[PDB]
Amino acid sequence: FSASVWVMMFVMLLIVSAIAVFVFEYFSPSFTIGKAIWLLWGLVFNNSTTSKIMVSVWAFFAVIFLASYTANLAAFM
Amino acid sequence: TFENMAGVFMLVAGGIVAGIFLIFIEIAYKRHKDAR
């Protein structure tokens, strides 16, 4: 139904989350270890200062991925 | 899988990374100007 290769997107998500955490840590000049992961996983999915707003542009990719996933799940049956 | 959804993802990924690279320096310069 989705991720036919099963090895590309599932590691792309991990690496993009890792680089997001890295840049969030680099933006120090709230908690990088705990809050960044929670906000990343609560922003892409419905279930759940200045630096967060400027990096909130990832919501475009989030909504695109959600729409693609739901369309694939509805059209592959 | 194929080029279709790889490209449709890489276009927006490049856009997002370029925006991240530009906005960081832009806001850094804005903060430096504000706190000159």
Please provide a written account of the structure.
This is part of a larger assembly, with chains A (77 residues) and B (36 residues). The longest helix of chain A has 18 residues, at 9-26. Chain A has helices at residues 9-26, 35-44, 50-55, 59-75. Chain A has 77 residues and is mainly α. Chain A is built from 4 helices and no strands. In chain A, 66% of the residues lie in helices and 0% in strands. Chain A starts with 8 loop residues before the first helix and ends with a helix. Chain B is mainly alpha-helical and 36 residues long. Chain B is 89% helix and 0% strand. Chain B has one helix at residues 3-34. Chain B is rod-shaped, with a radius of gyration of 16 Å. In chain B, 0% of the residues are buried. Chains A and B meet through helix 1, helix 3 and helix 4 of A and helix 1 of B. It is classed as membrane protein. The entry lists the keywords NMDA receptor, membrane protein.
Mind sketching the topology for me?
This is part of a larger assembly, with chains A (77 residues) and B (36 residues).
Chain A: H1 9-26, H2 35-44, H3 50-55, H4 59-75
Chain B: H1 3-34
